């Protein structure tokens, strides 16, 4: 019995450890968020199927790593779901062929936010999975330890909803003028969703974000966002109603707004956060 990754990295007879480098494509699902499907990444086979049958389980102590360590979830093993990190050995998968066959493991994260996310840097450890292999022939009891690494920079969603982009940059026309902000949100199932803006504001109405341009800044102007032609104050819930699998545009537009005093030439920049909330 031996195993290999999609990229040819092998663990031989007797077990051992290997790194698995995965191009992650995490996604929200109903009730759980996919982190990584390893059934396309890890393969094993029985070396002598005519006389021996191999038994393969996911062993207790399999867990997330790095920045996913604070989160709990589920693991789907051979069509059934179990708590993850694993607290008990799973039922077995039978390996009875010399032909490589997937190790049927997929990792999920339990939603805890509305539309939050955890940023993963490429090269980061995201999970450690313990494959236990025994057989019906002798007393072999081997461990195949799979260290799962993110191959790419990615955001793992932690909520029931996800966004078109986690960072959006827009350029306004030269003062005066406006520009739409492309930003949509969708949810795995229907959610009563809203959002609020965050940032430093200049006015008592809490609706004009300050100009924080560092180099050659303009004076006298800030940035104000509108939705449906209506100014959106910061720290105030905008209701999107019920949001489902079809993406819904937040309908945001950026504008300049005078903050007082002389308007002098220079650069303008405002950094504005969006945070979603269940209502």
């Amino acid at each position: 019995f031996a195993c290999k990754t999609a990229n040819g990295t092998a663990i031989p007879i007797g077990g051992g450890s290997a790194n698995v480098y995965v191009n992650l494509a995490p996604a929200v699902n109903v009730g759980q968020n996919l982190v990584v499907d390893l059934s396309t990444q890890i393969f094993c086979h029985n070396d002598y199927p005519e006389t021996i049958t191999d038994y393969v389980t996911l062993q207790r102590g399999s867990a997330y790593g790095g920045v996913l360590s604070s989160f709990s979830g589920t693991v789907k093993y051979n069509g059934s779901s179990y708590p993850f990190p694993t607290t008990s050995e799973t039922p077995r998968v039978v390996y009875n062929s010399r032909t490589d066959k997937p190790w049927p493991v997929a990792l999920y994260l339990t939603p805890v936010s509305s539309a939050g996310g955890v940023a993963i840097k490429a090269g980061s450890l995201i999970a450690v999975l313990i494959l236990r292999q025994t057989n019906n022939y002798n007393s072999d009891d081997f461990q195949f330890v799979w260290n799962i690494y993110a191959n790419n920079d990615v955001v793992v969603p932690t909520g029931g909803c996800d966004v078109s982009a986690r960072d959006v940059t827009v350029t306004l026309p030269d003062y005066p003028g406006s520009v739409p902000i492309p930003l949509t949100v969708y949810c795995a199932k229907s959610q009563n969703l809203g959002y609020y803006l965050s940032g430093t504001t200049a006015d008592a109405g809490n609706s004009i974000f300050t100009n924080t341009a560092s180099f050659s800044p303009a004076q006298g102007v800030g940035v104000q966002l509108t939705r449906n032609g209506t100014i959106i104050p910061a720290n105030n819930t905008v209701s999107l109603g019920a949001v489902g699998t079809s993406a819904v545009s937040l309908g945001l537009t950026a504008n300049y707004a005078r903050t007082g005093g002389q308007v002098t030439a220079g650069n303008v920049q405002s950094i504005i956060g969006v945070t979603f909330v269940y209502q």
Partner: peptide, 13 residues
């Protein structure tokens, strides 16, 4: 925040 929006602009003479 869930999403960070950066808005860039300029005031000309």
């Amino acid at each position: 925040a869930d999403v960070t929006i950066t808005v860039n602009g300029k005031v000309v003479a």
